[PDB]
Amino acid sequence: SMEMEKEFEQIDKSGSWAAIYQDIRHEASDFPCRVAKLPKNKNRNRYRDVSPFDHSRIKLHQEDNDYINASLIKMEEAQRSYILTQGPLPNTCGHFWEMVWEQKSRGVVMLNRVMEKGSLKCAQYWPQKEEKEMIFEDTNLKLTLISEDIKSYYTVRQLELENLTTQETREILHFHYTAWPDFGVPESPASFLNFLFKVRESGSLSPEHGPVVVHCSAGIGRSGTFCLADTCLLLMDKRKDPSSVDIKKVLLEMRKFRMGLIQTADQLRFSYLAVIEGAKFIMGDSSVQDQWKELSHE
């Protein structure tokens, strides 16, 4: 029916997802990451092969060291921005919340678990109990769990972030997709889309706020899948025209701002599936959102 559906079926028939995905890797932008590779920043990076480009990196408003492994993905035509970052390290959780503060983000999207495949993919950067708030002494921020709503494959938390210097406080929404394997895919397009539209419905993507912060362990694989689907749905929505959306071109545009977005060919295949199914809602069938909520078994 849609032009991306036709392409999807042709790629499936010819079994060429791996070759399509490798073409994207071959054509993807390459820009320098000199700040990331400075010896003083070695312990601020989780993975030595995952670095922010200098031209798009988020700078901390600190005179000491402004480096965080985070990139501003600025989608000009779609008119949506995202900050993609790695899962914070035990020594960078203060930097992480400093970035959320300085960038005026309303939401944090977390697509991984703290422990995956027997390893620590992300530091425990938010408080798990209301009565045990966290204080980040290096960046002078306080973080309190206000409430949380646990569902079968995601959790939403309300956090309070306080600048202890000025005593201003902000409510941060934490959207935690808990059933997405590292280097894997979500269990259905339905559950992925149900989650994405929860983030959308919260207002956290509004241009009145700073860019939403999106992370997985590296800030590229699952994070890239999430952002590609959202931007493609937004572009389709802006024009009310599925055919104007070239998913591979959009992914290449995003990769001008951070390397390695979408880490497997199956994640690329999955993001086609999410966009194709999300298109039903965009183009005026709001009952599919109800089917997602049911099929996902919240």
Ligand X SMILES: O=C(O)C(=O)Nc1sc2c(c1C(=O)O)CCNC2
Binding-site entries: 182, 216-222, 263
The residue from 74, 121, 170, 238 that contacts ligand X (CB under 6 A) is 121
- Residue 252 found at the interface with Cl ion (CB under 5 A): no
Question: According to CB under 5 A, which one of 57, 113, 151, 222 is a site residue for Cl ion?
Answer: 113
The catalytic position among 33, 93, 122, 216 is: 216
Q: Residue 31, SS3?
A: coil
Q: How far is the CB of 293 from ligand X (least distance, A)?
A: 25
Q: Is 217 in the site for ligand X (CB under 6 A)?
A: yes
Q: Is 182 in the site for ligand X (CB under 6 A)?
A: yes
Q: Which of residues 259-288 bind Cl ion (CB under 5 A)?
A: 260
Shortest Å, Cβ 179 to ligand X:
13
Note if 216 is an active site residue. Answer: yes
Print the binding letters for residues 40-69 with ligand X: x by CB under 6 A, - otherwise: -------x-xx-------------------
Q: Between 173 and 227, whose beta carbon lies closer to ligand X?
A: 227
Q: How long, in residues, is the chain? A: 298
| Interior angle at CA 130, CA 126 and CA 135, nearest 5 | 50
Task: Report the partner that residue 39 touches, choosing among ligand X, Cl ion, none (CB closer than 5 to 8 A by kind).
Answer: Cl ion
Long-range CB contact pairs, 39-48, < 8 A, 24+: 40/65, 40/67, 41/65, 41/67, 43/89, 43/91, 44/68, 44/69, 44/89, 44/91, 44/92, 44/95, 45/69, 45/86, 46/86, 46/87, 46/89, 46/217, 46/218, 47/86, 47/218
**Is 36:69 a contact under the CB 8 Å cutoff?**
yes
Q: Report how many residues bind Cl ion under the rule CB under 5 A.
A: 10
Does residue 216 interact with ligand X by CB under 6 A? yes
CB-facing half-sphere around the CA of 127: CA atoms within 13 A: 20
Closest Cα partner for 172 from 219, 137, 125?
125
- Tell which positions 87-116 bind ligand X, by CB under 6 A: 112
How many of the chain's residues bind ligand X (CB under 6 A)? 13
Is 218 a binder of ligand X (CB under 6 A)? yes
Distance CA 177, CA 150 (A): 10
Cβ-based nearer residue to ligand X, 47 or 243: 47
Helix (H, G, I), strand (E, B), or coil: what is residue 79?
coil
CB of 178 or CB of 291, closer to ligand X: 178
- According to DSSP, the β-strands at 115-116 and 212-215 are unpaired
By CB under 6 A, residue 222 contacts ligand X:
yes
By C-beta, is 218 or 276 nearer to ligand X?
Answer: 218
**Residue listed under structure tokens 């020594």:** 91
Contacts of 201 (CB under 8 A, 6+ apart): none
C-beta atoms surrounding 16 within 10 Å: 14
Which residues are annotated binding-site positions for substrate? 182, 216-222, 263
List residues with catalytic annotation.
Answer: 216
Give the footprint of Cl ion on this chain (CB under 5 A).
25, 38-40, 113-114, 118, 120, 123, 260
